[PDB]
Amino acid sequence: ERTTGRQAQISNITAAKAVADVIRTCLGPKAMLKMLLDPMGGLVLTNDGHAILREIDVAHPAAKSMLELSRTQDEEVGDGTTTVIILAGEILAQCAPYLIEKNIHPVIIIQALKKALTDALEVIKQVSKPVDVENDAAMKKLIQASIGTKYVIHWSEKMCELALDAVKTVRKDLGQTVEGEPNFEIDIKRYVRVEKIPGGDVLDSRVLKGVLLNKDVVHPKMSRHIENPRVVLLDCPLEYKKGESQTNIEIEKEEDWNRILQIEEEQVQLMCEQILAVRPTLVITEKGVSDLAQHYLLKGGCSVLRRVKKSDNNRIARVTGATIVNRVEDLKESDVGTNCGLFKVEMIGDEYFSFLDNCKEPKACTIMLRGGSKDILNEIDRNLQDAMAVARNVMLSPSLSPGGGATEMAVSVKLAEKAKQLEGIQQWPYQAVADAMECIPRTLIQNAGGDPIRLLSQLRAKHAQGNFTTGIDGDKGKIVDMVSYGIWEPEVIKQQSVKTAIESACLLLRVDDIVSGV
Amino acid sequence: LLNPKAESLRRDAALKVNVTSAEGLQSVLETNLGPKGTLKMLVDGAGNIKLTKDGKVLLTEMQIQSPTAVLIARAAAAQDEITGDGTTTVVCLVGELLRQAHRFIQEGVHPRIITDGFEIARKESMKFLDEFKISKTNLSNDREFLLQVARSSLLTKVDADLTEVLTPIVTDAVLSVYDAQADNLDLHMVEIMQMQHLSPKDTTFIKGLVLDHGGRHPDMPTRVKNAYVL
Amino acid sequence: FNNSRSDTLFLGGEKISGDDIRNQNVLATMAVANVVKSSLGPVGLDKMLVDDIGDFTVTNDGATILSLLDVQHPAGKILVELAQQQDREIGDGTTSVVIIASELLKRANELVKNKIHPTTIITGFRVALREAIRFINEVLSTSVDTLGKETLINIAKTSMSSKIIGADSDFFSNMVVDALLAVKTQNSKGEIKYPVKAVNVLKAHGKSATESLLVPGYALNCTVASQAMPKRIAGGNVKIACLDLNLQKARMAMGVQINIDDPEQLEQIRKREAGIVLERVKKIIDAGAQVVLTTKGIDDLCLKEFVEAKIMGVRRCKKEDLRRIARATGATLVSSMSNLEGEETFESSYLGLCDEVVQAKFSDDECILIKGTSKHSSSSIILRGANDYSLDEMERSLHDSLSVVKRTLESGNVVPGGGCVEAALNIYLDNFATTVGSREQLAIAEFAAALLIIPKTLAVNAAKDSSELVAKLRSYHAASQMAKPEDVKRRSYRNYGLDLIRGKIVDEIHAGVLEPTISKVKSLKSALEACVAILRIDTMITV
């Protein structure tokens, strides 16, 4: 019913500690397998952190907040799902004795977590090292981190080309002191939307700039490409129009019957004549096209496309600029067909397609993927999004940070040094943040099999005297430098990792009561 | 760290249950192996008793709640589609390998090192697999060697008296369907038909096809030799 | 523990009476009030509201928590309806009103153990409430300290401290305070309120944020478009014409094309297309408009007519700004020029009025400054910042800042917050208790001491000691109320409240924490009526 006093603070930390404790063995490339027991006779052997917690039914509401935290992390970064949840769960565990046994007010701890978050972001920027974002050979070795241990490792070179050529098309990199700096905005969601074509080879997969249409041309003999195109978009079909009111044509006189039959053909030509007034080279309609409208527009020297989806024409309007106008008599001259390179109808996989591809980058592109089957295309799809997500974090900041527990320990050492110079009651919960940062590398040690206490203190000694680039090896499990075998990941992953971790930790600390009601 | 209506086995306690789960499935299937194996009963619940020594039919007819035996049964089903023989052999290798590993788990050895030791030894096992194997000639006059392969697949599931009955049947069934060349063989061309009223030791091979409905009339010829077909 | 099993008054349910229902009302009201006790004040913490489906939500708003809280008891149900009465009058403060009524019931419950009848306990609270309203009258004051000093800048400084804008905020708070006081207006029938949507905010990045300018009037971003026309007109007055439809050469339609078969129709239709808009330009010059603001632009031929007359034309004005300029100039934005069969600007009808129009040089920016129109009571802010992302955070912060400032100043009657009202009434009613001297003196004394729960729990949520600050809060007011009624003073030094950010006692009037009087008077009035409704229950029949 109601949880008052310190009982609510216990249940909020315990719920977040239980969610993190499950995936502690899910961290690292060597991470163990989790066998889940379904209410039925089935089982789940998947080690993916998101696929596990999704199949785990939770009761306490703080556990549901940790589930929604991983959903936000999945939209930002493609990997490291368990890294954020374990880190956010350990911070509440380390602040638990200070909140109760030491009797520190929670607002003091929350204000201390905001100071530790700002200091942590500064340390990550200091331990991060720059890399050339314009080097094609360097970007392939970066994305390769999210490539290997997958079926795409053989095509990885082609997987990086499809990843780079896609983000480089939709990215706008600008800055100045006049109109401001967009800070290298890249949209993978809307603009990079992909079309998967079965059959063929991965080498034949191209990134097309434009909107791809699966519908063919109404007539076999027609202009294949136009130099300076004029495009008209309209939802209305092409056929004889009828009045919305009651229309009855009574024919008595003998010679007036054939005249009305000619007018019906003239009305179809009139609707096409209103389109030809702007001299379009391309006509795209949502519904079908009558055979008469096909012949009238064929002699008019324009291209006709039929049975095109409405959602596709909306994406065409942004890369082109032609606005959909229902009635042919209302067609504006302001909307044009400029920046369309080729109409090429070339057949791909025994199926006629239509290409809107151009020579320019109107902040969007359509990726054409080829594979050996639909399951291969689905594997290329999800891997391409993770491939571009890594390339996105590299284009959203030049600096790379060492992984494998190197950055995790590098921050914890600097937090311990700033703790001695930070006066006030917030010093005690500030030291709990550094102890929570040591949980991630110690977790990789526990999954490796080595002594967690011995290897952690020795790894901390490497950061204190030597450099911060000495991490833990995944294959071996012994303390080594990350410069030898680069595990290096972009900094944006570490940025949003500690960022949302403090926001999720403070959110649960602010709730002192839980009641049930509608 | 618990919520209502939940159960969790943690901190090496799941390993003691999973290894025991393999020891329970192993000891049941340990009884039937090779020609000296044993026969078991499978009740479908409808009252039909079925006796078979094949581990493929056994694992499908039994229902096991233990999730460790489920993965063994699912993986053996993939082995039954690929290999088609040695279902018990795979189970006996899995159970004993976990027993030898569980002894090292009690010693404090991390399971990753244990699994890494299996993959390294498996790669070395594949090297000895190619060295120990014997290359047999492609000659189809090898029936003498096919008599040895037949007794391998027969003697296991039978009293060895049906072996001498089924040895010329199975060996002649393969070579008659198989043309002489390297092309392929079709198992669908061999029909499997069952009849009652006569002892199993009288099982014979049919070079042609067998059918049920015959000519009905007392004066129709019973034996017609070298006749045209319509 | 639970009360049940009447075995009296045979009916379809139980009977609870005596100290059984009196103790039940205290336990029920306490559990309902304990939810909003930790959310009191800005230092309070939000709590989670879970439904029956298993979903939840987290918010610190006391109006939403009490509305979504499930109360199965009638004593707490009055508190639920109390939040509805508080939302329909003031709209805010449900958190503090519940805490008051909760402590008043606890104080009245101890009076029952003192053998004091609850009827006099009710009347004893009503008599103290009549004086409490009169005591607020010596507390409350009008708008003060806005000349010679600024107490309003401390409000904007604390609100913008969470944004990048808070660095220069000391200079930026002066821009918000000095503008809001100058934009004061009167809408209809003596309201005297500050305009909500006024004080236009524009942004440009050429430089640092310190260079942001405050214009006493509207700043429109536009040019003259021709160097032959003068950049400064209107010494005495000007008539500004806000226009939408273009003055450009008129076409017919975008889908029709003009094909000339007869060369006579060529010159005819040509000069007719320009002649339609040229006459519309003639109606503007004859209307006495020195400044012409057009949304869709002006042609070159029609602009030359403005050059020869020294009339200022402007092309492609922002239509969203012209709507607010027309309201200040008394003008009306013309979307198309016509009435019935005619076309004209009606000779200074749709036209506006303004004192002066001057075009300042902003050092790589150029705009039009509008100052002193007919009835405006508005201004405009030209922002400069580190980048557009900074200018976006500034415009959002100036709206979040001014909003807190303008709502409190909208009511000309405010009282100091931070616990000043609750602590001051505790001192006044303590001396007023000696004016009765029979029975209610015990009820009035507990009524005044019950007001100390508001500053108490307010300091608890701030991670500060409530035993010290509250004890010091009463000492400063008690010593200041010694020489105050005698009309002889060395130094007054009253109105010291609680500062929970720095953990020290400061003057709330100088700190900028103020609440309107209508909020505090109706709070004690609503909390008392809810406490009386609980004290009036001597019996409960539960089916």
PDB file of C-alpha atoms in Angstrom, chain A residues 143-292:
ATOM      1  CA  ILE A 143      33.196  -0.007 -37.270  1.00  0.00           C
ATOM      2  CA  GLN A 144      34.906  -3.426 -37.367  1.00  0.00           C
ATOM      3  CA  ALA A 145      34.494  -3.562 -33.575  1.00  0.00           C
ATOM      4  CA  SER A 146      30.719  -3.969 -34.017  1.00  0.00           C
ATOM      5  CA  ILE A 147      31.279  -6.190 -37.069  1.00  0.00           C
ATOM      6  CA  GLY A 148      33.259  -9.248 -35.943  1.00  0.00           C
ATOM      7  CA  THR A 149      31.682 -12.208 -34.156  1.00  0.00           C
ATOM      8  CA  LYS A 150      28.952 -11.911 -36.803  1.00  0.00           C
ATOM      9  CA  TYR A 151      28.209 -13.426 -40.203  1.00  0.00           C
ATOM     10  CA  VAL A 152      29.163 -10.134 -41.889  1.00  0.00           C
ATOM     11  CA  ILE A 153      32.832 -10.414 -40.893  1.00  0.00           C
ATOM     12  CA  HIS A 154      33.696 -11.707 -44.382  1.00  0.00           C
ATOM     13  CA  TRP A 155      31.982  -8.749 -46.091  1.00  0.00           C
ATOM     14  CA  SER A 156      33.088  -6.302 -43.344  1.00  0.00           C
ATOM     15  CA  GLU A 157      34.950  -4.167 -45.893  1.00  0.00           C
ATOM     16  CA  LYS A 158      31.749  -3.867 -47.932  1.00  0.00           C
ATOM     17  CA  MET A 159      29.706  -3.425 -44.746  1.00  0.00           C
ATOM     18  CA  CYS A 160      31.818  -0.396 -43.819  1.00  0.00           C
ATOM     19  CA  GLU A 161      31.467   1.085 -47.315  1.00  0.00           C
ATOM     20  CA  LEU A 162      27.675   0.843 -47.094  1.00  0.00           C
ATOM     21  CA  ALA A 163      27.862   2.353 -43.600  1.00  0.00           C
ATOM     22  CA  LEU A 164      30.160   5.265 -44.458  1.00  0.00           C
ATOM     23  CA  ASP A 165      28.634   6.182 -47.834  1.00  0.00           C
ATOM     24  CA  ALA A 166      25.191   6.275 -46.160  1.00  0.00           C
ATOM     25  CA  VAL A 167      26.038   8.578 -43.245  1.00  0.00           C
ATOM     26  CA  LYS A 168      28.294  10.779 -45.385  1.00  0.00           C
ATOM     27  CA  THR A 169      25.300  11.432 -47.645  1.00  0.00           C
ATOM     28  CA  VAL A 170      22.862  12.503 -44.917  1.00  0.00           C
ATOM     29  CA  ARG A 171      25.376  14.331 -42.716  1.00  0.00           C
ATOM     30  CA  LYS A 172      25.691  18.116 -42.840  1.00  0.00           C
ATOM     31  CA  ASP A 173      28.968  19.253 -41.264  1.00  0.00           C
ATOM     32  CA  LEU A 174      28.980  23.023 -40.792  1.00  0.00           C
ATOM     33  CA  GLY A 175      30.252  25.593 -38.326  1.00  0.00           C
ATOM     34  CA  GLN A 176      31.029  29.306 -37.977  1.00  0.00           C
ATOM     35  CA  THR A 177      30.503  32.325 -35.724  1.00  0.00           C
ATOM     36  CA  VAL A 178      27.744  33.748 -37.961  1.00  0.00           C
ATOM     37  CA  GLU A 179      24.782  31.361 -38.342  1.00  0.00           C
ATOM     38  CA  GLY A 180      25.881  29.079 -35.502  1.00  0.00           C
ATOM     39  CA  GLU A 181      27.158  25.516 -35.310  1.00  0.00           C
ATOM     40  CA  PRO A 182      24.779  22.542 -35.770  1.00  0.00           C
ATOM     41  CA  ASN A 183      27.453  20.411 -34.005  1.00  0.00           C
ATOM     42  CA  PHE A 184      27.493  17.859 -36.849  1.00  0.00           C
ATOM     43  CA  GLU A 185      23.882  16.702 -36.882  1.00  0.00           C
ATOM     44  CA  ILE A 186      23.285  13.239 -38.375  1.00  0.00           C
ATOM     45  CA  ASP A 187      19.849  11.585 -38.619  1.00  0.00           C
ATOM     46  CA  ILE A 188      19.991   7.822 -39.145  1.00  0.00           C
ATOM     47  CA  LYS A 189      16.303   7.191 -38.416  1.00  0.00           C
ATOM     48  CA  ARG A 190      14.341   9.093 -41.066  1.00  0.00           C
ATOM     49  CA  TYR A 191      16.807   9.888 -43.878  1.00  0.00           C
ATOM     50  CA  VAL A 192      18.859   6.661 -44.040  1.00  0.00           C
ATOM     51  CA  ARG A 193      15.762   4.444 -44.394  1.00  0.00           C
ATOM     52  CA  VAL A 194      16.704   1.292 -46.285  1.00  0.00           C
ATOM     53  CA  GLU A 195      15.137  -0.926 -48.960  1.00  0.00           C
ATOM     54  CA  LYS A 196      16.168  -4.587 -49.031  1.00  0.00           C
ATOM     55  CA  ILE A 197      16.245  -6.341 -52.419  1.00  0.00           C
ATOM     56  CA  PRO A 198      16.625 -10.152 -52.421  1.00  0.00           C
ATOM     57  CA  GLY A 199      19.122 -11.920 -54.653  1.00  0.00           C
ATOM     58  CA  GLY A 200      22.462 -10.763 -55.940  1.00  0.00           C
ATOM     59  CA  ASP A 201      25.691 -10.141 -54.045  1.00  0.00           C
ATOM     60  CA  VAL A 202      26.802  -7.787 -51.277  1.00  0.00           C
ATOM     61  CA  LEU A 203      29.221  -6.214 -53.767  1.00  0.00           C
ATOM     62  CA  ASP A 204      26.197  -5.168 -55.855  1.00  0.00           C
ATOM     63  CA  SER A 205      24.663  -3.316 -52.885  1.00  0.00           C
ATOM     64  CA  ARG A 206      24.668   0.420 -53.583  1.00  0.00           C
ATOM     65  CA  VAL A 207      23.653   3.505 -51.627  1.00  0.00           C
ATOM     66  CA  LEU A 208      21.295   5.516 -53.823  1.00  0.00           C
ATOM     67  CA  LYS A 209      20.640   9.214 -53.189  1.00  0.00           C
ATOM     68  CA  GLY A 210      16.915   9.638 -53.647  1.00  0.00           C
ATOM     69  CA  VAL A 211      13.731   7.609 -53.196  1.00  0.00           C
ATOM     70  CA  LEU A 212      13.538   4.070 -54.584  1.00  0.00           C
ATOM     71  CA  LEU A 213      10.271   2.857 -56.110  1.00  0.00           C
ATOM     72  CA  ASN A 214       9.392  -0.761 -56.870  1.00  0.00           C
ATOM     73  CA  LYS A 215       6.749   0.095 -59.481  1.00  0.00           C
ATOM     74  CA  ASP A 216       7.675  -0.014 -63.169  1.00  0.00           C
ATOM     75  CA  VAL A 217       6.972   2.224 -66.181  1.00  0.00           C
ATOM     76  CA  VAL A 218       3.557   2.017 -67.834  1.00  0.00           C
ATOM     77  CA  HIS A 219       4.976   1.720 -71.371  1.00  0.00           C
ATOM     78  CA  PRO A 220       8.104  -0.191 -72.470  1.00  0.00           C
ATOM     79  CA  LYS A 221       9.354   2.436 -74.926  1.00  0.00           C
ATOM     80  CA  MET A 222       9.933   5.735 -73.109  1.00  0.00           C
ATOM     81  CA  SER A 223      12.710   8.178 -72.231  1.00  0.00           C
ATOM     82  CA  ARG A 224      15.029   6.383 -69.821  1.00  0.00           C
ATOM     83  CA  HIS A 225      16.689   9.501 -68.370  1.00  0.00           C
ATOM     84  CA  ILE A 226      16.098  13.260 -68.567  1.00  0.00           C
ATOM     85  CA  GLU A 227      18.807  15.933 -68.304  1.00  0.00           C
ATOM     86  CA  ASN A 228      16.779  18.636 -66.497  1.00  0.00           C
ATOM     87  CA  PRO A 229      13.672  16.896 -65.146  1.00  0.00           C
ATOM     88  CA  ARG A 230      10.317  18.405 -64.190  1.00  0.00           C
ATOM     89  CA  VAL A 231       8.423  16.263 -61.682  1.00  0.00           C
ATOM     90  CA  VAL A 232       4.728  16.447 -60.748  1.00  0.00           C
ATOM     91  CA  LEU A 233       3.328  14.603 -57.722  1.00  0.00           C
ATOM     92  CA  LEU A 234      -0.414  14.013 -57.395  1.00  0.00           C
ATOM     93  CA  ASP A 235      -2.528  11.530 -55.443  1.00  0.00           C
ATOM     94  CA  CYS A 236      -5.546  11.554 -57.803  1.00  0.00           C
ATOM     95  CA  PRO A 237      -5.721   8.727 -60.374  1.00  0.00           C
ATOM     96  CA  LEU A 238      -5.584   9.251 -64.133  1.00  0.00           C
ATOM     97  CA  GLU A 239      -8.947   8.482 -65.754  1.00  0.00           C
ATOM     98  CA  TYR A 240     -12.205  10.081 -66.849  1.00  0.00           C
ATOM     99  CA  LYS A 241     -13.516  12.364 -64.107  1.00  0.00           C
ATOM    100  CA  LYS A 242     -17.180  12.482 -63.113  1.00  0.00           C
ATOM    101  CA  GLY A 243     -19.241  15.155 -61.418  1.00  0.00           C
ATOM    102  CA  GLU A 244     -19.984  15.038 -57.705  1.00  0.00           C
ATOM    103  CA  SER A 245     -23.621  15.938 -58.408  1.00  0.00           C
ATOM    104  CA  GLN A 246     -26.137  13.993 -60.509  1.00  0.00           C
ATOM    105  CA  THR A 247     -24.957  13.711 -64.105  1.00  0.00           C
ATOM    106  CA  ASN A 248     -27.334  12.313 -66.740  1.00  0.00           C
ATOM    107  CA  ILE A 249     -26.702  12.765 -70.469  1.00  0.00           C
ATOM    108  CA  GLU A 250     -29.740  11.864 -72.589  1.00  0.00           C
ATOM    109  CA  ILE A 251     -28.999  11.366 -76.293  1.00  0.00           C
ATOM    110  CA  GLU A 252     -31.906  11.491 -78.745  1.00  0.00           C
ATOM    111  CA  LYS A 253     -30.499  12.989 -81.956  1.00  0.00           C
ATOM    112  CA  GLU A 254     -28.503  10.373 -83.852  1.00  0.00           C
ATOM    113  CA  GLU A 255     -25.328  12.374 -84.569  1.00  0.00           C
ATOM    114  CA  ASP A 256     -24.909  13.525 -80.948  1.00  0.00           C
ATOM    115  CA  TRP A 257     -24.094  10.050 -79.592  1.00  0.00           C
ATOM    116  CA  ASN A 258     -20.614   9.815 -81.114  1.00  0.00           C
ATOM    117  CA  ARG A 259     -19.871  13.392 -80.039  1.00  0.00           C
ATOM    118  CA  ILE A 260     -20.316  12.603 -76.338  1.00  0.00           C
ATOM    119  CA  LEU A 261     -18.061   9.556 -76.707  1.00  0.00           C
ATOM    120  CA  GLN A 262     -15.385  11.875 -78.104  1.00  0.00           C
ATOM    121  CA  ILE A 263     -15.872  14.369 -75.259  1.00  0.00           C
ATOM    122  CA  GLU A 264     -15.231  11.584 -72.739  1.00  0.00           C
ATOM    123  CA  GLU A 265     -11.863  11.034 -74.422  1.00  0.00           C
ATOM    124  CA  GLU A 266     -11.263  14.793 -74.496  1.00  0.00           C
ATOM    125  CA  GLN A 267     -11.897  15.052 -70.748  1.00  0.00           C
ATOM    126  CA  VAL A 268      -9.162  12.463 -70.195  1.00  0.00           C
ATOM    127  CA  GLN A 269      -6.908  14.471 -72.515  1.00  0.00           C
ATOM    128  CA  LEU A 270      -7.945  17.682 -70.745  1.00  0.00           C
ATOM    129  CA  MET A 271      -6.833  16.325 -67.368  1.00  0.00           C
ATOM    130  CA  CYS A 272      -3.528  15.359 -68.986  1.00  0.00           C
ATOM    131  CA  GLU A 273      -3.297  18.729 -70.758  1.00  0.00           C
ATOM    132  CA  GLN A 274      -3.481  20.528 -67.407  1.00  0.00           C
ATOM    133  CA  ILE A 275      -0.475  18.466 -66.303  1.00  0.00           C
ATOM    134  CA  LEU A 276       1.462  19.147 -69.515  1.00  0.00           C
ATOM    135  CA  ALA A 277       1.024  22.913 -69.057  1.00  0.00           C
ATOM    136  CA  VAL A 278       4.168  23.010 -66.891  1.00  0.00           C
ATOM    137  CA  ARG A 279       5.913  20.673 -69.353  1.00  0.00           C
ATOM    138  CA  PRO A 280       6.687  17.860 -66.876  1.00  0.00           C
ATOM    139  CA  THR A 281       9.110  15.075 -67.707  1.00  0.00           C
ATOM    140  CA  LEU A 282       7.807  12.808 -64.904  1.00  0.00           C
ATOM    141  CA  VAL A 283       4.303  12.062 -63.596  1.00  0.00           C
ATOM    142  CA  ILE A 284       3.885  10.028 -60.396  1.00  0.00           C
ATOM    143  CA  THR A 285       0.391   9.155 -59.162  1.00  0.00           C
ATOM    144  CA  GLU A 286      -0.814   7.173 -56.157  1.00  0.00           C
ATOM    145  CA  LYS A 287      -3.643   5.256 -57.849  1.00  0.00           C
ATOM    146  CA  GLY A 288      -3.702   3.530 -61.239  1.00  0.00           C
ATOM    147  CA  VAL A 289      -3.546   5.092 -64.695  1.00  0.00           C
ATOM    148  CA  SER A 290      -6.045   4.497 -67.495  1.00  0.00           C
ATOM    149  CA  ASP A 291      -4.817   3.296 -70.882  1.00  0.00           C
ATOM    150  CA  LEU A 292      -5.930   6.569 -72.488  1.00  0.00           C
TER     151      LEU A 292
END
